[PDB]
Amino acid sequence: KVSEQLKCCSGILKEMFAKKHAAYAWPFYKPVDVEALGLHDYCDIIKHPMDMSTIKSKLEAREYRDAQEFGADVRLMFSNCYKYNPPDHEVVAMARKLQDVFEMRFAKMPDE
Numbered sequence: 001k002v003s004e005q006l007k008c009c010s011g012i013l014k015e016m017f018a019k020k021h022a023a024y025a026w027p028f029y030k031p032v033d034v035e036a037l038g039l040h041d042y043c044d045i046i047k048h049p050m051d052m053s054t055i056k057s058k059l060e061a062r063e064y065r066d067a068q069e070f071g072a073d074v075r076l077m078f079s080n081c082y083k084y085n086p087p088d089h090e091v092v093a094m095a096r097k098l099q100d101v102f103e104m105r106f107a108k109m110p111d112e
């Protein structure tokens with residue numbers, strides 16, 4: 001069950017990095033560069049930053065013991081975006097599209 005779940009998590013993350021989703025996934029590929037973007041309040045608002053490259057590194061290091069932990073990091077990444085940005089910001093629309101890609105496939109997780 002666990003090995004199958006982690007292959008599903010790796011598949012989902014590989015799809016989230018695929019060129020077909022790149023037009024809305026790209027802001028989530030790497031840690032938010034607070035200095036480059038001039039987001040001087042980011043670290044005051046977001047206590048636990050998360051991004052797709054960090055999630056990839058954790059899967060490669062076998063840090064996630066099951067799908068629930070992996071899913072919690074993916075949702076943390078989207079939640080930080082929803083917390084920091086105004087609700088009508090273009091990046092929030094991109095986050096909702098990438099989260100729909102993730103949730104529809106994560107719902108198909110092997111359950112035995």
Ligand SMILES: COc1cc2c(cc1-c1c(C)noc1C)[nH]c1nc(C)nc(Nc3nn(C)c4ccccc34)c12
Pocket residue numbers: 026027028032033037039080081084085090091
């Ligand atoms: C404005 O939220 C971001 C911009 C970026 C970003 C990350 C974020 C971000 C925040 C904050 N909260 O969640 C995420 C995700 N990474 C970027 N890398 C580069 C090279 N340029 C960017 N520029 C963008 N500036 N604006 C206003 C955007 C709107 C739409 C798309 C990207 C830009 C971003």
